């Protein structure tokens, strides 16, 4: 037996985390740059979704290295495979738009 009495409280604490982390990460977003990825499982195969990370080859197609891209806040998954054209292209456009909107301090 357990009752979530702290449901109101923990959220507050969580936003405190979402405050406090943000304090350290002051210009940058809290979250990384995640891929837009179409789901499996025919019930959901029309659904698109947030994915974990893009790939090496896609980040190369964006025009940078993944080792550098992790410093730019772009989530990268090696074990994913890009197999759909439109997914790949839309995520490349996403990467380009993310590159357009950042300004990086030396």
């Amino acid at each position: 037996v357990k009752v979530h009495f702290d449901q109101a409280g923990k959220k507050v604490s969580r936003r405190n985390a979402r405050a406090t982390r943000a304090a350290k990460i002051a210009p940058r977003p809290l979250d990384l740059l995640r891929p837009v990825v179409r789901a499996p499982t025919v019930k959901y195969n029309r659904k698109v979704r947030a994915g974990r990370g893009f790939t090496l080859a896609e980040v190369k197609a964006a025009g940078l290295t993944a080792a550098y891209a992790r410093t730019i806040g772009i989530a990268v998954d090696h074990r994913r495979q890009n197999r759909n054209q439109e997914i790949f292209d839309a995520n490349v456009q996403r990467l380009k738009e993310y590159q357009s909107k950042i300004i990086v301090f030396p």
Binding site: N16, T20, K24, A26, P29, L30, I103
Partner: protein
Amino acid sequence: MTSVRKRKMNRSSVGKATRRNKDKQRKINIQSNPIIAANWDYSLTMAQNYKKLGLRAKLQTPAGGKEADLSKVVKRIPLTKPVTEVVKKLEELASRPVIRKERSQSEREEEWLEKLYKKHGDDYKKMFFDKKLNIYQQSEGDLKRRLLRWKKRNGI
């Protein structure tokens, strides 16, 4: 307050090691850039304050509803009835070139290049197959790169 420890610590002459924290955990300093530390407000939120900056706070797709906060009046559809600033400051700062230093050359190896420059002159196929003063057997073009850097540094 019914453990033996808590009751003894209550009855003790030591007094509780009491520290107050709950007020100061809500407020945070941003610690990182003095520009954001200037424009930070401590009143709006992380979210509202990043929006008032112009920086995208969360990347993508917030769960829940944002504040559309009544900027405009929305009127009913008749259905055809019958008859930036701080962004600019940080953009200048990232656009500001840092005072950089040219990577120079070390005195021994530029002297080595100076020996090669007088021994062979400028040609590279002779100095590539030189035993004395090319004992590390430098690459054909690394020789060119170091000599061009040395010439731009000294001796045209």
